[PDB]
Design a protein around this ligand. Sequence first.
Ligand code: 8GT
Ligand code: MN
Ligand code: MN
Ligand code: MN
Ligand code: MN
Ligand code: MN
Ligand code: MN
Ligand code: NA
Length: 326
Amino acid sequence: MPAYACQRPTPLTHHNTGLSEALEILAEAAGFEGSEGRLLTFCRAASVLKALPSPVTTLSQLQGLPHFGEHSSRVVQELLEHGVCEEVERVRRSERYQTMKLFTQIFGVGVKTADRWYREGLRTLDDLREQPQKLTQQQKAGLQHHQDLSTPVLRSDVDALQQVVEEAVGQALPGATVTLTGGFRRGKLQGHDVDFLITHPKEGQEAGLLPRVMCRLQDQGLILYHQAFERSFCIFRLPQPGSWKAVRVDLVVAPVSQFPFALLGWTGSKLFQRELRRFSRKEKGLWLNSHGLFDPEQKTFFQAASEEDIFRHLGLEYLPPEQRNA
DNA sequence: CGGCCTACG
DNA sequence: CGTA
DNA sequence: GCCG
Ligand SMILES: Nc1nc2c([nH]c(=O)n2[C@@H]2O[C@H](COP(=O)(O)OP(=O)(O)OP(=O)(O)O)[C@@H](O)[C@H]2O)c(=O)[nH]1
Ligand SMILES: [Mn+2]
Ligand SMILES: [Mn+2]
Ligand SMILES: [Mn+2]
Ligand SMILES: [Mn+2]
Ligand SMILES: [Mn+2]
Ligand SMILES: [Mn+2]
Ligand code: NA
């Protein structure tokens, strides 16, 4: 089993959900306590189990697996022996974990903000609403639309949103294209948001596009929240039968020279992409981001025509999006 | 021991 | 900091 | 927490 998540296929449906979900609780809790390193190990260990071909039924089956040491192995051992891990259950039931999960799931609130509020004694969304001076405009929007943003986004919603984004993009720039990215491109049936990547086949024509698209959406009444720019993390007023619901939408514009890199980056998964970028730098000496792949010794960028080209230049077997669910 | 993805808003 |  |  390869050590990096970008070296192995990880399908959407896999055989060790119970074990991986427990390790991901410990990862999330490690993040809440400010240890990104422990979060990463627990995330990596969870993802190793997602890549296995069969259910783990014996502790024996972990031997040699990357990112399984004493702590992650003990969690699996307890789950196999007893069906529950005491440490996981203690974190699950804790006021700190529950509140930090509640606050960080708000759009505009991360760990550092949530931790400050926790330390000030706040515990509920009504507590935050009662203290509105404590909130940025982004946080006000996330709180205002929190109920809708907690409702899974479905494929029906994606299709409707892609049509209205395509209409605005076509009005803003003839020939520009819209590509669905994020979890839906990896095959997920649900999501917390919809992600779109916009480009134009003629390099340079996309300059200034995203403000024009946003103006056209805003004047059709489709925008509840947004804020030269090339990324917009929006909330849309999506029409529904007789009504509407708020939906998070991410819009990104890239020049066509960068489109394979942006498509790769925005397709995820989040762990897959951080592993790929780690692999690129640490194993291949190349610097990867959503704009390009840089060789820092020759001072040159790799010209890619496809995602496949990027994998090949990194010496990796190509993985289609549905196998990037690390 | 120290690293842990990487930008833009 | 937030996007996460 | 695990690993180079
Ligand atoms: N399901 C869900 N996910 C949420 C909420 N709030 C929130 O921040 N998230 C975050 O949403 C991210 C994954 O959502 P997603 O379904 O869009 O997956 P994705 O791979 O496209 O992630 P991406 O859109 O962040 O790139 C996670 O990092 C998770 O922390 C929420 O209320 N529900
Ligand atoms: Mn026991
Ligand atoms: Mn998404
Ligand atoms: Mn995500
Ligand atoms: Mn840029
Ligand atoms: Mn150390
Ligand atoms: Mn440590
Ligand atoms: Na958040």
